[PDB]
Every structure is written in C-alpha cells, then in structure tokens.
Design an enzyme around this catalytic site. Sequence first.
Site, PDB file in Angstrom:
ATOM      1  N   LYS A   1      14.556   2.154 -21.652  1.00 48.31           N
ATOM      2  CA  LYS A   1      14.247   3.097 -22.722  1.00 48.31           C
ATOM      3  C   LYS A   1      14.545   4.530 -22.298  1.00 48.31           C
ATOM      4  O   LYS A   1      15.263   5.254 -22.996  1.00 48.31           O
ATOM      5  CB  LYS A   1      12.786   2.959 -23.153  1.00 48.31           C
ATOM      6  CG  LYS A   1      12.480   1.691 -23.933  1.00 48.31           C
ATOM      7  CD  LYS A   1      13.536   1.415 -24.991  1.00 48.31           C
ATOM      8  CE  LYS A   1      13.320   2.278 -26.221  1.00 48.31           C
ATOM      9  NZ  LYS A   1      13.997   1.718 -27.424  1.00 48.31           N
TER      10      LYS A   1
ATOM     11  N   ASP B   1      11.821   7.753 -32.997  1.00 47.96           N
ATOM     12  CA  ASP B   1      10.868   7.187 -33.944  1.00 47.96           C
ATOM     13  C   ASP B   1       9.885   8.241 -34.446  1.00 47.96           C
ATOM     14  O   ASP B   1       9.802   8.499 -35.652  1.00 47.96           O
ATOM     15  CB  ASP B   1      10.120   6.016 -33.298  1.00 47.96           C
ATOM     16  CG  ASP B   1      10.966   4.764 -33.223  1.00 47.96           C
ATOM     17  OD1 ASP B   1      12.039   4.735 -33.861  1.00 47.96           O
ATOM     18  OD2 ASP B   1      10.561   3.808 -32.528  1.00 47.96           O
TER      19      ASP B   1
END
Length: 1864
Positions: free
Chosen positions: A105, A72
Amino acid sequence: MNLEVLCGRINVENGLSLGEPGLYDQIYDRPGSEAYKINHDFTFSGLSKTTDRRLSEVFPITHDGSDGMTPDVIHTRLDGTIVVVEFTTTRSHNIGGLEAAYRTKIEKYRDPISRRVDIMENPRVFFGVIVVSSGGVLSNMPLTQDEAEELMYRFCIANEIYTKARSMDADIELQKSEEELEAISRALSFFSLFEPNIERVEGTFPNSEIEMLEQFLSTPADVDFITKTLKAKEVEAYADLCDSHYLKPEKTIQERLEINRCEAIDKTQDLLAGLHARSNKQTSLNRGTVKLPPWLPKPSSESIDIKTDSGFGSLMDHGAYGELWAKCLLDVSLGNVEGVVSDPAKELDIDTPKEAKITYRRFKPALSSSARQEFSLQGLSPFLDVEDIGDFLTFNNLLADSRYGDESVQRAVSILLEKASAMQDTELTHALNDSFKRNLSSNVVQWSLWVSCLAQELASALKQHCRAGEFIIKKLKFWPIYVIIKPTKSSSHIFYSLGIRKADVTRRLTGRVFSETIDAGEWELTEFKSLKTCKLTNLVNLPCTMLNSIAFWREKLGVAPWLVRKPCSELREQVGLTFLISLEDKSKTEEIITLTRYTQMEGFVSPPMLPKPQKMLGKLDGPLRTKLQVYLLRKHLDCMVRIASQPFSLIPREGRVEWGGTFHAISGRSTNLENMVNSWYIGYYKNKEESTELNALGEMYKKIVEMEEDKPSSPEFLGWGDTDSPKKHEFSRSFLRAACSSLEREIAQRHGRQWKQNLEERVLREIGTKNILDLASMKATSNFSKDWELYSEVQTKEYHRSKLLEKMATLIEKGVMWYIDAVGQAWKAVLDDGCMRICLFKKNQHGGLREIYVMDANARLVQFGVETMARCVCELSPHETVANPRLKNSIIENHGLKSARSLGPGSININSSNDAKKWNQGHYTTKLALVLCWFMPAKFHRFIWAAISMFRRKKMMVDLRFLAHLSDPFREAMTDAFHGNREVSWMDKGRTYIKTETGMMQGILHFTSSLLHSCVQSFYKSYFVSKLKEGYMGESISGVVDVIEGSDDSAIMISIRPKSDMDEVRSRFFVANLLHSVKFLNPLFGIYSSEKSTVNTVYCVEYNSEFHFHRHLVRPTLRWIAASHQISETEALASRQEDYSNLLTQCLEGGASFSLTYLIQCAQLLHHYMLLGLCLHPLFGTFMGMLISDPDPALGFFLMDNPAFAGGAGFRFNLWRACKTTDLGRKYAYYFNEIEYRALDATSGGTLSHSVMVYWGDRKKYQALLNRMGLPEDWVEQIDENPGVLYRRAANKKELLLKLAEKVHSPGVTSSLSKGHVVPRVVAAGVYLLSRHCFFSSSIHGSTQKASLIKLLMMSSISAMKHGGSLNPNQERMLFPQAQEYDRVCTLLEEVEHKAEDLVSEVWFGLKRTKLGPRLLKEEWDKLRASFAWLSTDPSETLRDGPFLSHVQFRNFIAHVDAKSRSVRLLGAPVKKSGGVTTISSLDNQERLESISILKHVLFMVLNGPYTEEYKLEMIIEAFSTLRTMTLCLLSNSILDQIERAQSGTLGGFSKPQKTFIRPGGGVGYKGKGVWTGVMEDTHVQILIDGDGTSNWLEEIRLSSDARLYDVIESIRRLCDDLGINNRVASAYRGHCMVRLSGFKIKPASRTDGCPVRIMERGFRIRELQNPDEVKMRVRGDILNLSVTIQEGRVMNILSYRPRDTDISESAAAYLWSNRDLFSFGKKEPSCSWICLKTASVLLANDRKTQGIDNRAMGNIFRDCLEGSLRKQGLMRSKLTEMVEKNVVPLTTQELVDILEEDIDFSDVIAVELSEGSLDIESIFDGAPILWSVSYSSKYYHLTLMDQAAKEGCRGLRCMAAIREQVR
Ligand SMILES: [Mg+2]
C-alpha cells in the site's frame, strides 16, 4: 462509528509523517443489484466515506509529475493538518501476512506525496493505512478496542456474502506469484509423486497400516458409548469426592478440618518409620558438610611463587601428613622443580605467543614407605541429632563486614568500576557503588573469592599426565595458601590438600559445620579431600551467586541500599541457607525444597474441599544419604502438618481481596505472600555443559524405559474400537474423534468456513519451496550406524557427533537443491536401514529440560518436513500458547473484562491448575498421526503416515564408559540384561542399544502434542458449557469458561454470578464436581494427571511460573537472577557483553526494580573480569593498564548502564551513550573518514571490532579433508572477480560451493570438538587474543562523529534513544521520600514493532529489491555515499579504498553494521513515562490560547485578525519570560531586543547587502553577491548568497558548532523561503566540507554537487546592532509573525506560531460566556457564539449572505465552516443496507455446546438430592470485590429542520435547495 474522532486522535510536528503501525486482535466475544466490491465497501461504510463527491485528485498539495492519484479519504482538520488514509482487505489468517499489504500500500503513495510535500510551504501531512483480516487488524490509525472488533464483524459478514457470488476466480494477484509460483509448483510435483513404501512399510514397523486412517475418518462417533461413559464416570468422581473429603455425615469444618490433620500425622509417622527401619540406625553421626576449611586470611601483595624461610619445622612431628609437606617444601626449596609448562594453545588448536604467557607447574617426587600404605587407601537414619545445622542457620559471622575493604584483591576491580562509572558521574552512582563495595567485604565473598581461585586452578589440572612419581604445588595468588594436586588416569576427580602458615589466619567464619583440620606444627593441612569435575563449574561462580543473595533478599525486606542497619534475624536464615544448598550439589538435596511448592500451593483450597498436602509423599521416600538433607526433610515434614490444620484465609476489604497468614516453608515465619513465593526457588541454577558421568547418567536411562514393558499385547485398543477403560498405555478412538471434531468447529467460526484452502496453499508455499539448502542449520547431530552396535566390535573407540555440515556438503556436491529433491534420498536411506538411530545428552542443572536427543542428521530431514506441517496448524487454534507466542499474557488478563461484558458486576472465580504425569513416555505415535491426517486436507496422508511410522523401533545409544564400568535394583538388572538373563528384550543379549517402541521424544516431535492437548481442552470446555446449561432439574446457571494450555501445562478458569443466599452455596458445589472430574475423563485419551495439580483455587491461577493472585501479578524473580552467570564459549570477545546484557534484560521483566539490576551488573562485572584473568596469568597488571587508557567494548572492557533505567535498553544503547559523547569518538570516525587499514573491519553481532579477536577456531577439519569437491585454492580471488554471488541465492553448483566456503569460515562456526573442562577453555580463549594484541603500534592514527553518522549507524536513536537519553538528564541526583501505596499498574512497552544494507545490492544491483521510487530509491545512494567516505558506486573501488581488505570480507560489514536494540516490556505506575520511575524500592494563558487557536480559522478577513488579538492582549496578562508558550509570553506588545538575545528564537542582520535593480514590473531586483549572518539557537552561522541571472542562489554555509544541525537546516529552509533564495544550482567547492546540500538534503563531499556546509568552530562570532524600532506583527494563512524588515522589500520572520488542535477548551467557554465587556464579541455575527462555542436566528440569515454579498468582515470565500453540516449529519446514520436488511445481531454467540458436532442430542444426569447444603461458612456474593485482572457541536439546533423537511441527490431531483447550497 466516526472519522472525525479517529482523525482527531493523531498528531504531528511537520512535513510528512507515517507514524507507527499497530496490531489489534480478538479479545472480546466476536458476535454476528450487482457488485464485486462488497467486501471493501461493506466494512468502512457509512464512514470511511467522505460525503464530498471527489476531494478529489491529489490537487490540494500542488502540481504535477504524478497525477496525484485517487485516494479514499482526504481529511482536513481545523488546524491545517492534512490526513490521507487508504483501506484494503486481505484474506490470509497468518500474522505477518498483513505485512505484505502494508508494504504494497505505502508503495503506491510514497512517491507522489513525498514529491508534493517538497514543493509547498510548511506542511502537515499524515499518511496512514488500514488493513483488516479475520484474525486481526494492523494499523496506526490509532484505534481503540471496541471498534477494532466491529471492523471484523462486518469483514466476516462481507466475506460470507462475497464467497457466494464469486465465478472463474480469475482475479489472480499479479504482485504475487513471481517466485511463489516457481516455488509452489515444486511442492505440488513432489507430493503428487511417490513418497510412500507401503507394502514393506507395514512389515518394517508393527502397527503402521492404512486401515486406521480410513476407518477413523469415515465412521461417526458412537453417541451411545459416550453417553454411557460420561454417566458412569461422573458418579464415580462424585463418590470419590465424598470420601477423599469427609462430607456424608453431618459435620462442620471445625471437626472436619482435624480428621485430615490426624491422618496426615499418621501418614508422616508411617513414612518416618518406614525410612528408619531400612537404614543403619546410628544416632550421633559426626562429619562435616562443607568440605573446605573455614580460613579467612587478610589478603596480601599478589604473586605466584612458593615463598621461601618459611619451610621448615617441626614438619616431622607426624610423619604421615606433615612429612609430605616437609618433603615437598624441601624439594621446591632448592632445585627439585620440573619443567611442565602448561601453554595456552597446546591447550587449543592454532600464532606463536610470547614468553610472558607460559607458566610453571613444577613436578615433584614422592615419599618413603610410611605413608604410601596410607595414601594408597585414600588415593542414614532420619532421627539424627542435626540441630547443629540449625545453630548455624541462627548464628553466623556471615553477614558481618570484615576489615578488608581496601586490599589488593578489590583494588584491581575498584579501579575498573571507577573507569566504567566515569560516564554517569552523578551523586546517585557515587552512592550505588559504595553500597556494592560494602557487599564485597561482607565476610562471605571474602571466603568465596579464594574458593573460586582454588576451583579455577584445579580446573586446569584435569590433564598433563603427571608421572608415576607425582605431585604438584601452587600458591594461588593474592593470599598465602598452598595446594598439592595429584591428577588421575581419567577426567572425573582430583586430589588435593590445603596448607597454610598458622599466622596469617585472622578470622574463621564459625559454626561446627565446616570440615575438621589437622593441627600440624604451626600448619593446617587438610588430608586429601576429593572433588569431582561435575562440581567444578559451580564453585567458580560462587562470589557472583552470593552477591545476588546479599542484594536481592536485602531488598525484599524493606531495606534501602543507601542505609546501614544490623542484619535482621529473618535475613541471616535466608542467606545461610542458599549458602549451604549451593555447596551440597547433590540432586536429592534440592528435590526437597522444590517440593515445598506443590505442598504449599494447596493452602489456597476453596470451600468444600480440603487442603491435602500429604499426597506429595510418594516422592520423598529416598535413600536419605547425606546430613543436611535430613534437616531439610524433617523441617519440610512440618509445613504439611501446619497447613492441613489451618488453610489460608480470605479477607475482602473492598480492595481487591488479599490472603491470610502465609509463612516461610523451611523456617516457619509469617513473612508476606510475594516474599514466600520466591523462597520456593532458593536452590536453582542453569547450565549447558555435557555432564557425562556414571551416576546421573544412570537415572536418565531408567527414566526412558520405566514405562516400556507396559505396552499391551493386543493392538485392538491402540487405534481401533472403543475401550471404556484404559490400560495405562492405550486410549479410545471415538473420544479422540469427538474431541478433534470440536477444535475444527471453534476454528471455522472465528476464521473460516473455508480455511483449508489457505492452510494448504500456505504450508505448500512454505514447506519445500523456501527451504533452500546451504542454510539449514549448525545444529550438532550424531553419526551412529549399524557397524557400531556390537560392544565386542569396538570396545575402545570414541564418538564425535559430526556437527551436521557433512550431510550438508555431501549433498551439495551431489547436485541437490530445494530440500525438496533431498527427501528424495533421505527416506529410502532410512527405510532399508532399520529404524531411527539416536544418541543422548545430559545437560546437568538439576532438573527442567535436562536431557536432549540428537537426531543423526538422516531422519532429521523427514522430521523437518512434518515439523512445519503441524506448526502451521497450531498457529490457527486460539488456545495454543506455544505456537502463538505472546497471547499467554492476553487470556488470563482478559478473562477479566470478558466476564463483565457478559454479566454485570461481579465475578466469583473458580480456577484449576492441571498438568500431566508422564507426557513423554505415555503417548503413542498413532494419536499424533490421526490428529495430523485429520487436519491436513487431502494429500498429506501417504507422507505423514510414513514419517510418523518411524518411532516404533527406535534405537538409543548408551555411553561407552558406562558399559565398560558395567563389566540401584535397576543397574543390577541392566548388568544381567547385558551379560546373560533375566531378559528384558529391551537391549537384546550383548549389544549397545536401548530399543523401545513406546513414547515420543522430548524436543523432536514438538508442536504436535500441543494439537492433542488443544483438542482435549476444547472438548473439556464444550462439555463444561453444556453441563452448566443444565445445572439443577432444568435450572440453568450462567457462566463463562476459559481454557488456556501449552504443552504439558493447562489451566481452567470459570466465573459465576450469585443472585441470592443458597444459590451461591448451592451453585459453588455444582462447580467443584464439574471441575474436579478432570482427574478422570483424561485417561480415555492418552493423558494421566499427576498429583502436582491444585483443584479449585477460588481467586488465583497458577500457570507457568508466573502466578496470578487476584489482582496482583507475582513472578519468581530469583529464577532469572541466578541465571545471569552462564559461562560463555563464543569467540567474539565482544559477544560476551551482548549475552550478559541479554540475560540481564530478563530480570527486569521478572519484576526486579531498577535499583537491583545495577547491582546485578556490578556482579556481572566480576563474573566477566574473572574469566579474562584475575587469579592466574600474572600479567593482569599490564592487561588492566592497557584497557584503562583505550577502553572500548571491542576489547575486554565492560560498560555499565545508567543507575536509573538500568538494563532497560540493551547493549546498543550503552554503545550509543558512550561512543557519542566522551568515550572515544575517534576509533569509529577513523574507520569512516579515511581512505587507503587501522584494523581490517569485521562486525560481530551488533558491534564491530579489529578482526583479530575473531580468529581462533579449528576450520581445518572442514576444509583440509572437505575441500575434496572442487573449490580451488584461488577461492578468494575467484570470488572477488565477481561479488554478485554473495547477494543472490544461487544459479549453479560452483557458486553454491563458493557460498558454502564463505559460510564455513566467518562467525562463529567452529568445528574442533572440544573435550575440555570449559572453564579454562575460556580463560585461554581470552588471554590468547588479549596478549597477541599487546605485542600497541596502531594506536597513533580528529574526532566527534557527525550528526549524520549516528543516524545511519544507530538507527533507533532519535526514535527512542533521545527521549530516554534526555529524561535521564532529569533529576539524576534527587532523593524521594518513602511513602506507602498499593495499586495496580499498566502494561508498558517501548520498542515493539509489527533494511540499511539492501541499498548496496541495488546500485550495484539489480535486483528488484528495496522497492524505492527513483526519487527516494534514487536518492538513498546520496545519503549512503555521504556516509563511509570511501564508499562508491563501484563494486570494485569499494575495495581499492578503506577499512575493508576484500569485497568478501565486507558481506559482513554491510551485513550487521547498523543495528536496532531489542524489545522491553516492564510495569509501571500509571500510563505516562518518568512515570515508570516511580518504582525503585496560571490559567489566563489557557483561555487566551484557546481564543487564538479557534480565532485564526474563523470566518474573518485577514486584516480583521489583528483587530482581535491586539485588543485581547490587554486583558490576559501572563507572567514572565522566566518560562511554545515561551513565544506567547514574548508578546508584551523591558526592552524587547535583549529578550530575544536569549532563548531559542531566530534573528540576524544582513552584513553584506547586494545591489538593488529597478525591474520594470513593480519589483526591485537584488543582483549583487552578498553575505547574510545570523544567530539561530546558539550557532552564529554565516550564509553566503549569490545570483546574477534570473534569481539568487545559496553559495556557502558556515556554523560554529555541530551539536544541532537537523533543526538549524529547518531554520534555514524557511529563512531562504522568506527572502526568496533558490537552492537548485550547483557551486564550486572551496574547502574541506563536512557534507553538501541539494535543494535541502545531505550529501558527499566526494561529489562536489551543491552548497557545502563547511563547519568552522571559529567561523563567525560577530553581531551588528539591529534597530528595534522596525518590528511589526503580521498575519497570513493562519500564522503569527513578530518579524523585522532587514532590507528594502525584504523582511525576516523572528518568531512564529501555529496553533495545535488539542487546545480547543470548554472551561474557557464558560469564562468567555458574556462578561459582555469584550466588544469584539458583539451582535454582528455568530462571533461570540462561534468563539463561545454554541449555535438572532442565523440559519436563514446566512442564506441571504451567500446570494446577497454584504459581509463587511466575514469577507472570506463564505464557506469555511458551513461545510461542517456533515459533523451533525454524521451522528445521524446514512447506511441503507446496514440497518434494514441487518437483523440486529441476535447475539448468536453461544460459546459452545455438546449438541453441536454431536449430531444427536444429549442427556447427562447425576444425583444431587439430600447430601447437605450447609457446609460452606462464608459470604462473598454480596461482597465488594471488583473487576478481576472532539468538540464538534458548532451548528446543531438549526440542522434538525432538514430532518423535519425530510439517495439525497435522488430526493432532490426545492424548498430546501438553499440548505443544499451549504453542503455542496
Ligand atoms: Mg502448571
């Protein structure tokens, strides 16, 4: 808010860093086209966003096995560090439900980034993850408080938007449901099946019917009844207030404050008269209160024998008592002894111990008819003259050093102290020890040592069945004293008489308070006193409970442990009182000091109100039996006459306002505030041993039944309609509904609007799905049945309680499984058997949790199913301070700020303290059923209703000895009730069971009352707000209310700003009523407030035992100190130290300074060596001499901590400090580095031992009579045939039986069913194992431990056992000067968080566990194979090898090996460490350093770099090299060569060069086999290198010392990178190496894989005269190099430098702003304006340089800083859908209100016209008191033109494209 600042917060050293995840929560008031992604990109929007289009695939960290998948945000700072962060959102309200996201994650990104960071040069890479929830945020993106909430404002809004556009909710999560489906399906199946028995259930129990639930859930609350009841109750409360305090006639405090004094005098005199009349009026009694003679003799040589030429006399003077001693002395003189030989394992279950452990106890015979007649008979008013006790409390020889400092009694322990402190050998310790010996000779531990000896000796004589002719005689040791014992038929009491020669008694501790003594012919006989057994476990630990009063109290007075002053007058009284209380163990003697708290807290009473302590009287009636109690009562009855006339005063100094003159309760002295609050806890101790005995067991039978007959006949008030008035056992329905309908709103406004659809799918997912049997518990239970009721049936049997493995096994054999096919029987088994069956336990301490009920292991199942069903509902509510564990320290401390955001500066505070009178026998089981079936969504009804329909006829089983003794007005009632009438109907005629319907139980139905109290407090808050909103005829006072309450404890905090003159007084009054009305409006519920509450404290809050005075926190420390002696019956001889350390680490959190939790350790030393053996078993000498040479905690060897930082870290830290450096360093290595049995390895707790002290215990009763279900004798071998059943859950019945069999036999699961006085049962369990090891051998089998061993074995070591382990090699000797300072401190915390065995499960196994990548997941074995040499990939050979026998035995060695020291929390002096100790009651470089940290990154050609620092070093002249700045000082452009010869640089010649070869590509080729040597950080390493093909490689490494190799590897990781050597190819093993290395890793030895680092202490000690003239300075990608060329075309970097980012100063800019002299800073470029950091006109002058390229010096890519246009484009916002369609949060947070969840509006009015306004006399509204408990501006002016000239892309799609160039 920023991405910049967030990224700039963090820091790192090298390669790759993950940091530490933190968890934030809610503290402040929480405010507030097609897509499916809004939930993600609504939050983290505007910023989470990188305005660069891609940045892209992971390219910047070079090459591809992965791809580099797309993240991101990939940020890069101005110091080269790389930051990669990812964001994801979860909808789960449970803490720990975020752990799943934080684990899934890092799994995505751990492999490729670890792969890329290994294939580039020096790297700074940071990986972080951010997850958000409606309840909290877990991250190590290390954020602040404000924005943590902001991230949740948008999260809630985004979820609200998301829910609506959602369809077939088709997302299913593939990563979950692998087992959760197979789990949830089972609970669905079960609950969908038929659990209720509803036809006969309504008959088996009185009130359980399905007509209350339906008529409760579907009928709205009657607002008329409520609006009448409140209006009727408020006027009553007001009228009561105006008459309990005197307010109606016009008066002032002066003549008001005296009337209550007069009436309190009246009441005390009334009580005194009532007591005096009902007693035998007797003025001068005469007796002793201490029942032991006051002899203090000088100790002598140790021995256990009755000495001889003493005996004779005169014994013959009386012929009563001296005649007895003469007869026994003459018996023992010659022959007359007998062979009674207490053995140590006759005593217990067991082998074959040896001669030296069997001692004699010598019968005697008996006496003629003179004295038998007398031995047969032996075998109160409140106006007494008791001032003798005062004379004793004011004059003592107690705290007066004797002359016995050097005697044989402490010489035993004064040597163990030396051996222990031999580690921290400092000057501090050698002063903190001679201040503890000074307390071991203080004339009171001297008298207490032989008392403890006597008590230990008498504990063993509770048995042995001495004959009709009877006596015993022993000389306890170390001093000549003689006792004569006579056991009884029973176990309750012991007869003894002490005798002693009249010549050894040197000193008597004085006063007239000790028992008298027969004056015989030069002997002192003490005429057969008697002591029970309940008073024996105390006298044992008497020395360890006086040393903690001579040290604690001596510290609370301003005295220093390294000084010697006279004992102050205020000290003797506090010590002589805890001495007396500790010996008169009668319960009602301490029930009077405790109640000095509830009668002294009332002195904090605020304006209009009066201190009423005399309400505490209806608990002091008593029988008043003993004598000390009389003095205690007549002193305590003046602390409530002194206070009621003068309350404590407020004084505001602008400082956080302190209180007036407080004073000691018993002895009235105006000592300080924090000093008095500990005096309320003088007599307090804890214990766990069952105390079955006549007297105390009686009161615990009365307490349970005292509110039984109160139950009303009609059930119309219990569940049904409103009542408007309670009957002491029933409550109203509509109020219960209107109260439980407020928490359901306060939950949904924070968490949900959907939440049931997660609460269910969580509970369901947990309740019957992961509760797999074979792991239920070892919680002892009961076996009581219908065949045990008739007392006439079995008047002579016994009762064992069947610790709870029978119901386990008997089911396991029956094909059972998930605890979900088990509710399966056991509910039917209860329904058709009557009711619950319960037995009882009395854990005597004096009070607290003093009675616990066993469960019978057959209702326990159906109760465990409802336990979680409510524990999960509690977890959501915000006030719950018993399900949510830690927030109790986050609501009182945060009210605080939370008051000030709302309103300016401030405060005023008004606080209550609430409680409940009878919280157990006052509730009725319909309330809890209604609350539960109100919160549980849809189908939890037919089950919870039945499971709660069990406490309606509950049967309790009284002791058997009790009923035997039966055959005070209350025992007289029970007797008639058992034999014949008046009838009670509670036990019916002649049976054994207390049968009662009324009331829940103490600990069984827990987490369910907390829900009730939560709803009650929520209603209270929602009503207080609504009343504050209408104060006076519409005028609205403003204020915040906070309600925090656990079970049977509550608190209410309120605050209001005063803006005037009446208005404070006019408002404070209006609060008092509102807060005083909680005495009423609780009886409408089932809650009765007692008289132990304190209403309207003005600045304090009293919750559970921590008190919150205005800004200073105070906690009873004495509560936990006296709780550090609890006796240990474990049998892991090394677990005792674990428990001692655990109990010690709580005194720290109790406020005890560091100088005290070391004396506490010194006392625990005694308490520990007194139990192995110190007063008996005369082989301690040998037992000491063994440990004096071995010492390890694996045997009885105690480890004392560091004086500074004492008890900070747990036992594991001391095990690390001691095993590492100079304790053993061999006993652990030998376990790890030898193949083919020092001692069979077995781990207990955290440590590991010899598997010989893990042996004693009766496993027989579980396997000789419970091996009747398969489990063949081949059991160990058949398991060893396959070891796969040890790690997976289960597949069939057989393997389940094997798992049960392995569970039964290892630690600590003992079953034989002890009856014994536990005190000898521990000395036995100690000396048995301590002896069966003495008979040496094994001790004849070189050491240190290597650095790679500590890391695997002690995991936290570099994390926090090195920081503290190096800051204590800090001043260890200094002595600070005593100063004075008062200040609030921080909240500090060391090892908080949110393994090393799962590695094994997988090479062997498969089974998808520890999720590594096959890089690390397939690289962990290497590190795990290097360590515990003999360990391999074989599942069998793990066995044919060392220190196990078997694979079965090792499940415990991989099981705990490890292990990870606990949590500690503690205060401080503010924020930074060695800044927490504290406690224990030159700029020229900076400017230059900045001008380099910014310079390396400027637009500059690499050669122009050294153009500036070279000239710069001519004006910044830092001092000497006498102290990273060290390298900086190294830059004088002496001789330099020797300056590197010291101080942690790196250099080394090339001893054996290779052969040079001219390769045709412009590069020489090194081909020979050569050797490089060097000296890096004091190692003198050798580096063997070789290569003959394409390149060279690494052959061998040597080094002289192994202290530091993790850093040396770095100094070699780059040293090859410099000269170009590869480390991929393998080598041929040459010698006995420590480990080997793969490209840069650590390994085994046993593999011969790569370059081995073969340590040789003498390897190479030579150096060869490097020529200094070849020394250059270099520049590169930003790096400094003061290097040296060693060979032709091969250089060697000596020193380096990388500038941090936390060094960009602003003060240097001013200094650098134009003293125009710096020529390099001229008019050529934004130089001198980049460095001097401020933005002739260069904006337009740069659009030319990017198209026309003529920058003689700025010859870079031309885009290094111009991408920073976003820095100033960041503070200007870019979020479209966030400002225009975001109606500003209109502050929709109104706290709560009564008109919501009450469908109709309300009108609540009272009468306040003309009473008075002038009652209060003070002023605080005008008072002072306060607050109740980067560098981005590079180009900023020339950007706003872009704002003037003008989604962006769209707009573009002219006159500004030149600027768009700078952004693209
Ligand atoms: Mg309380």
